[model samples]
Target: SDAPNFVLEDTNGKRIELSDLKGKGVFLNFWGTWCPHCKKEFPYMANQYKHFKSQGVEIVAVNVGESKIAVHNFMKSYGVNFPVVLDTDRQVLDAYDVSPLPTTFLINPEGKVVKVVTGTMTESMIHDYMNLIKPGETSG
Candidate 1:
């Protein structure tokens, strides 16, 4: 199924949308600052994003219901290069039907949700998933 589209604000309350990422691969994650495993995943994501961003795959982290300062401060430690959207009202959370602490949706260049992953992922796994949806590469 196509991933549900959403409109959310970043830490600075700048507006962002799923449609804005069209024609690129999206590693869409629903996470909260309170989650421990989510904490572990962030570092791996940070490294992966640095490498893949220029390659046309992007990570869009959806911080579910966290305050702007909290999310912003937490990311500073990780040196996050990807966009982190604040789901202040949890509207985007419920719309995606996510129930886990960290749910990742792998959306291909065509805007299709090719995979749904829940829980923390290792660096290698994260790398492979990024490759799966990357533009102009044959899917293995």
Candidate 2:
């Protein structure tokens, strides 16, 4: 199935849409600041985001129902440069049908859902999933 499309505001108040990243693979994650597992994933994600940006992979992190202040602090510490949308109203969360602390949808360039992983992922696992969607890019 194709991944659901969403338009949400990032920390800087800029709107981002899934459809906008059409030609790029998307590492879409649903997470919350309070989740321990999610915390473990952020630092790895920060580096991965920068590493993959040049290879046409975009990280779109959806912060589920957390205040701006809390999310901001977490992002600051992690030095996240990827797009993080605030799902303060839980509308985007409900749209994706996600309930896990860290649910990730690996989407291919064509916008098809390639893999769905729930819970935390290690750096190696993240690179593996990225390669699955866009081969050679991660390893190169």
Candidate 3:
């Protein structure tokens, strides 16, 4: 599947575009702080971010219609090191057609969607998905 391009502001007020992240594997997750499943997966995603990032992967999380303060608290608690964008208007979320609370799209370096996962992912599962995005990654 071809990934659609969209621009959004991160917590630090930096505008990021999906197209700008080309040539790097992008793990785009649509989620909210209110969702239990999303809450459960935040830490797991945070833990694997550094490893995947070392392999030329960019993990971008879109917080669905939430304030910066709320999401910031959650990010602080989970120690999230990835680039998190705020979908305050829900434009990006609707554009992606995201319905599930924690839908994750694995986009390859060429900006093509490799896989769409609709639930929580284990650490090992994240490793496999990273391999699909960037083959033969040495980071564990």
Candidate 4:
């Protein structure tokens, strides 16, 4: 009766609890190594990861069917700092009903799917989403 619960393995083999992030604005992005759009947007998102975390936002990336080695190499090459979870079995992808790569789900603090953006995300678009979901982070 709620968002699907899952335990995905990070690069280090640690389990990351999806339900644990309830009440926080989360970016649940389904990606793959071969998707050029996904590859392009990742580094920009990573650059903002620390800032967003400090500002009450969290982003979790699910790499569909990619090995830990694959993800590690990608991250190292891109200098991405966020946790890239392995979905080698596509368990996480199936839970989200992902039909395509580079699909982004904006899960709000209420643990509900607020928005879905397909394809690539520009840096400004990411900021727009952050500003939209931010509670008191806005100046009215």
Give TM per candidate: 0.93, 0.92, 0.93, 0.90
lDDT of 3 by residue, 83-112 (tens): 999998999889889987789999998999
Candidate 3, superposed: residue stretches over 4 Å from native: 135-140
Q: Give the CA lDDT, 0 to 100, for residue 14 in model 4.
A: 87
User: Once superposed on the true structure, which residue ranges of model 1 sit more than 4 Å away at CA?
Assistant: 137-140
Per-model lDDT: 0.88, 0.85, 0.86, 0.79
**Candidate 2 per-residue lDDT over residues 5-47, each given as its tens digit:** 8899999999998999998889999988787877787888887
| CA RMSD of each candidate after superposition | 2.6, 1.9, 1.9, 2.5
lDDT tens digits, residues 17-107, model 1?
8888899999999998888877788999999988888878988899989887888888987677788998889998999899987899999
Please, what are the lDDT tens digits per residue for candidate 4 over residues 24-122? 777888898788987788888887775787766778888998877788788888878887888889987888888868888887776677787895679
The C-alpha local distance difference test score for the whole of candidate 3 amounts to 0.86
Candidate that would win on lDDT: 1
Stretches > 4 Å off in candidate 4: 138-140
Could you tell which candidate, 3 or 4, scores higher by lDDT?
A: 3
Q: Of models 2 and 3, which has the larger lDDT?
A: 3
Candidate 4 clash total? 0
Query: What are the clash counts of all predictions, listed in order?
Result: 0, 0, 0, 0
